Nucleic acid binder design. Structure first.
Length: 242
DNA sequence: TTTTTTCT
DNA sequence: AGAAAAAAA
C-alpha cells in the first residue's frame, strides 16, 4: 500500500535517488556525454528543447536520449529551432509529429535565449519558477507531461554544469501519462496524482526524485553497483513495483 | 485506433 | 472541447 511504499522510498531517501540518477540512469549518462562536447548554456537549452519534443516517441527513452546526445556532441549550434529542423527528420527514435514538435521549439526559442549561466543558477535554486516560466513560454498548463519532464531534465543538466545539487521541489508532481497510470493500477485503486503526492510527502522524497527511482528499476536496470545497504532497499522497492 | 500535443 | 497532428498497429 501507500504506507509501505513510502517507508521504503523514505529509507532510500534523496541520497538514494541521487545515486540512481548519477550512476544508473542512462539519460543522465547521455547528458554527461553531451556536456563534454558543447558549451554549458547551449547544453541546458538543448536539454529543455529535447524534453519538450520527448513525447509519442518511436523508441525507448534511453535510446532517444542517447541519439540526441550523440548527434549534438561537437556541433556548432546557433538557432535551436534550425538545429532541430535538421535533426528530427533524420532521427530514428523520434519520427512522429515532427512539424508539431518543431513548432514547439520555434515558440520556446526566445525563452531559451534567456538561459545565461546565471539565470540557470537562479532557476536551479528555484525550479518552481522555471516550471511556471516554461509553461507560460509555451502557453500551456504546467501540469502537462512534457513541461514537468523538462524541469526534471533541466535538474540533471544544471547539476552537471554547476557542479552542485539542489533537490527537486516537493510541489512538482510526477509527470502524468499512460505509463504511470498503468504502474499505479498495478499497485492500488487510488488515483495516481493523489497517490504519488501522498507517497512523496510521507517519505520526504520529492516526486521528481521518486520518478528517478521508478523507471530504471522497473526497466530492469541493475542495482548491483549500489552499496550493500542501499542495494537492499532498492531490492525491496523492486519487489513492490516489478 | 494507440502512442501527448496543438489549436480552431 | 476535442478533432487532427505522424507514424504504427
Amino acid at each position: 500500500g501507500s504506507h509501505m511504499i513510502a517507508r521504503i522510498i523514505g529509507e532510500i531517501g534523496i541520497e538514494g535517488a541521487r545515486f540512481i540518477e548519477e550512476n544508473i540512469d542512462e539519460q543522465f549518462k547521455a547528458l554527461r556525454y553531451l556536456s563534454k562536447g558543447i558549451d554549458s548554456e547551449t547544453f541546458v537549452k538543448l536539454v529543455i528543447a529535447n524534453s519538450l519534443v520527448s513525447y509519442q516517441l518511436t523508441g525507448k527513452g534511453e535510446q532517444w536520449w542517447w541519439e540526441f546526445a550523440k548527434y549534438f556532441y561537437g556541433r556548432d549550434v546557433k538557432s535551436i529551432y534550425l538545429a532541430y529542423k535538421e535533426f528530427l527528420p533524420n532521427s530514428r527514435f523520434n519520427r512522429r509529429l515532427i512539424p508539431q514538435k518543431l513548432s514547439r521549439i520555434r515558440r520556446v526559442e526566445t525563452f531559451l535565449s534567456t538561459l545565461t549561466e546565471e539565470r540557470i543558477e537562479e532557476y536551479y535554486g528555484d525550479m518552481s519558477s522555471l516550471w511556471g516560466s516554461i509553461a507560460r513560454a509555451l502557453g500551456v498548463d504546467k501540469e502537462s507531461k512534457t513541461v514537468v519532464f523538462s524541469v526534471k531534465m533541466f535538474g540533471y543538466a544544471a547539476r552537471i554544469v554547476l557542479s552542485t545539487f539542489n533537490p527537486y521541489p516537493m510541489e512538482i508532481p510526477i509527470p502524468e501519462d499512460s505509463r504511470i497510470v498503468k504502474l499505479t493500477k498495478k499497485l492500488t485503486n487510488e488515483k495516481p496524482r493523489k497517490f504519488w503526492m501522498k507517497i512523496a510527502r510521507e517519505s520526504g522524497v520529492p516526486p521528481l526524485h521518486i520518478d528517478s527511482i521508478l523507471w530504471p528499476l522497473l526497466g530492469g536496470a541493475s542495482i548491483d553497483s549500489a552499496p550493500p545497504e542501499l542495494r537492499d532497499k532498492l531490492a525491496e522497492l523492486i519487489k513492490i513495483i516489478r
